[PDB]
Amino acid sequence: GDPDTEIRISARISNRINELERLPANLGTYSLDDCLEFITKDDLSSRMDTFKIKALVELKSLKLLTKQKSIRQKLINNVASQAHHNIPYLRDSPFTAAAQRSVQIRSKVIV
Amino acid sequence: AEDTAKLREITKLALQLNSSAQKYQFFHELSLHPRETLTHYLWSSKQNELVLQGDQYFNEDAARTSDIYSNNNNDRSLMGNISLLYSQGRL
Amino acid sequence: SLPIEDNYIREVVGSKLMECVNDAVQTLLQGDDKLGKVSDKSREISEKYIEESQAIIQELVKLTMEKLESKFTKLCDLETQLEM
């Protein structure tokens, strides 16, 4: 519930989406550990894209947020819709055992 | 008419008598035997507290966070049937 | 298991008595000298519930009488309704 505070969450999600969609694609890195690699004029060291990956994992995880919610709805409504066949303390209850026994009563025939 | 409300009052007073009779019978059995009714209490009230504490991880603001799936191997209710629901096509 | 909006939920949105009673029962279930005292307390609690139940029984017996008396008047109308 509470739809007044959910628009304020979506406005902060879309703020970070519009912030990450304004970064340049030609982003490279330079760590302080490259001096042991001896980068020449044409070397192509393997520590250039250590932040360009992390600038895309966040941008594509903020877009698959509605994608993972469908998988969570398909998981929770399949592990919690029964809730009385794998959980032992809920199936060992006097009301639940009598209810599951009494819903399987076959109708009585006449004569 | 007044007969329906009168029978309602008689039925309510009979339910009060049934409550008083059951509360008498519980203390009467506790007076007859003191041993196997207190262990019965410590078992049945503990099971009733486990039943009433069986629906707490499915709230509104509790399921939208990530403190259900991540690092909760002590829960044992979920995150163990993902190898079973995938084999049935329920996703 | 991916925390994505878990930062934004934290940005937006920032008993003992019955356990002591259960521990008291667990201490009372060790010595046999206390169960007699518990039964002697429960005997007068059962006498209190006998006094609770008998007044409800007497009030039921009273409240039956007017519902019977209305049917007695309906019965006494028949002594002329049949003679006619």
Partner: peptide
């Protein structure tokens, strides 16, 4: 405890917006 990493090297400054890196200035 698994926590989402706060990447401060990617985020832009809001209050000052003048002491940031030259690749994040535009």
């Amino acid at each position: 405890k698994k926590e989402f990493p706060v990447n401060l090297t990617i985020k832009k400054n809001v209050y000052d917006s003048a002491q940031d890196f030259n690749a994040l200035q535009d």
